[PDB]
Amino acid sequence: LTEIEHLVQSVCKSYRETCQLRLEDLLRQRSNIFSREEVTGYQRKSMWEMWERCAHHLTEAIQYVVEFAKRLSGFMELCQNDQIVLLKAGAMEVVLVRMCRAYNADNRTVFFEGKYGGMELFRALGCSELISSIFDFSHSLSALHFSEDEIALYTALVLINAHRPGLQEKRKVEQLQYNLELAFHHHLHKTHRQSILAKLPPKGKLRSLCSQHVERLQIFQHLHPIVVQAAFPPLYKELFS
Ligand SMILES: O=C(O)c1ccc(-c2nn(C(=O)c3c(Cl)cccc3C(F)(F)F)c3ccccc23)cc1
Ligand SMILES: CC(C)=CCC[C@@H](C)[C@H]1CC[C@H]2[C@@H]3CC=C4C[C@@H](O)CC[C@]4(C)[C@H]3CC[C@]12C
């Protein structure tokens, strides 16, 4: 078996071990939808409470993406600067992509605290525009019906991007990126799924949505700080300073 077929297997394994929620569970729970009364309960919570809940869920989701990154071939052999540069730019882009698995395009609901709810669940945050953009992005991804293996390979490429500003060893990230691009393209060809390539988000789209998202989280963090046990302190200290 080729280096490339082994790379496909390694990335798909890493994803399976760090996917946080099982696709099977997410699909089964689609019928489990918040009642009008439960939605009203969430809308009546203080911004501060909804922020504490959402901030903690987002931090947990980031930590699954850090673990995913640490299991990708070559990631740990990059200099720490480059690990931080990739995860700082990339980890929340991966969370936003991972969301499409927990999103039902039929009723525009997301899996949140054990049931599916629409974007009005989050009314107390005062972020309707930004949250609507996040729901829209998941909506556009859901049309692809990504396989588990496609999302493993795609989210590896979201992270391993030699064009991120600030890399010391751009050559080394280029080498890992070329191999992951070949693995993704190789797997799509083998599974007759090259049709998704033209349907993938235009680039800049994920970067600019993620930029806006993180900007808002940094404002909330500045006004009402949460603390977590840092999975990757050098990275954590670059956002939670
Ligand atoms: O456990 C850790 O080591 C760790 C855990 C999380 C991050 C990380 N948080 N983050 C946020 O945007 C964030 C979140 Cl999710 C919750 C509350 C406040 C914030 C904010 F202050 F940064 F804005 C990120 C964005 C992009 C990339 C990595 C991260 C980094 C490291
Ligand atoms: C802008 C702002 C202040 C808040 C954003 C509100 C809202 C859009 C956030 C809060 C919790 C997030 C989920 C948390 C965990 C997961 C699991 C992951 O495996 C996939 C992603 C997912 C489902 C997150 C999706 C985005 C959520 C709902």
Side-chain angles (χ1 to χ4, degrees):
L1 268 85
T2 69
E3 168 182 344
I4 295 300
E5 285 186 334
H6 282 284
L7 183 57
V8 174
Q9 199 272 354
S10 178
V11 170
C12 296
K13 181 166 169 171
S14 302
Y15 180 69
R16 193 173 177 198
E17 284 168 347
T18 68
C19 64
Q20 186 184 10
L21 301 170
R22 305 161 50 197
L23 184 60
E24 193 181 334
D25 301 343
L26 285 172
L27 289 182
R28 198 190 46 259
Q29 297 214 60
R30 260 138 153 80
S31 59
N32 193 15
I33 290 155
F34 279 120
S35 79
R36 191 62 224 156
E37 170 144 298
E38 291 169 321
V39 165
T40 298
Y42 277 110
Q43 295 175 320
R44 288 185 70 198
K45 293 181 181 308
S46 65
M47 176 172 286
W48 273 242
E49 196 186 332
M50 279 303 283
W51 161 244
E52 284 159 14
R53 288 178 185 252
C54 293
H56 280 291
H57 296 317
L58 285 162
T59 297
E60 179 171 15
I62 286 287
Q63 291 172 337
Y64 281 95
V65 175
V66 178
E67 192 51 51
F68 171 64
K70 284 187 184 261
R71 290 161 186 234
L72 291 182
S73 294
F75 185 84
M76 301 279 61
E77 287 68 56
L78 295 173
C79 69
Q80 188 180 256
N81 166 278
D82 285 12
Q83 294 179 23
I84 299 157
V85 167
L86 297 183
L87 282 168
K88 186 167 177 180
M92 184 64 73
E93 290 186 8
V94 168
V95 169
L96 291 171
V97 172
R98 282 181 164 215
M99 182 176 155
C100 74
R101 292 170 77 249
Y103 175 82
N104 190 352
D106 293 345
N107 58 6
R108 310 184 72 95
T109 64
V110 71
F111 192 70
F112 180 82
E113 296 193 342
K115 304 189 173 185
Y116 278 81
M119 55 172 288
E120 77 283 357
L121 208 68
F122 304 99
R123 197 190 75 190
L125 293 174
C127 291
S128 70
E129 194 157 298
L130 170 58
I131 290 168
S132 188
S133 290
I134 293 171
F135 273 62
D136 292 343
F137 179 74
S138 252
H139 203 85
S140 72
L141 291 181
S142 67
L144 280 63
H145 300 97
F146 275 131
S147 77
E148 288 291 275
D149 290 350
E150 290 158 0
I151 217 179
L153 289 159
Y154 177 63
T155 59
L157 284 166
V158 166
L159 288 174
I160 310 301
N161 176 354
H163 286 122
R164 297 303 199 187
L167 293 176
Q168 305 186 358
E169 302 169 327
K170 195 205 176 169
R171 296 281 77 67
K172 303 189 47 172
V173 180
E174 267 173 355
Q175 179 58 263
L176 298 185
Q177 176 173 352
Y178 295 151
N179 285 347
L180 287 167
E181 289 174 337
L182 180 44
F184 185 43
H185 297 163
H186 185 263
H187 202 61
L188 294 183
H189 167 92
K190 175 202 276 191
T191 62
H192 304 111
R193 287 284 285 176
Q194 290 163 309
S195 74
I196 72 171
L197 289 172
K199 306 188 177 151
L200 286 173
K203 219 257 136 166
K205 175 132 144 274
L206 180 50
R207 183 191 51 248
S208 53
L209 177 63
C210 176
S211 173
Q212 287 152 55
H213 191 215
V214 170
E215 176 169 323
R216 179 52 47 184
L217 297 178
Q218 289 180 130
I219 291 164
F220 272 111
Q221 183 64 9
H222 159 79
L223 288 167
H224 190 116
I226 68 139
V227 278
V228 77
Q229 206 51 74
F232 189 36
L235 170 60
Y236 178 89
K237 293 179 190 196
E238 282 249 331
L239 280 156
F240 282 77
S241 19

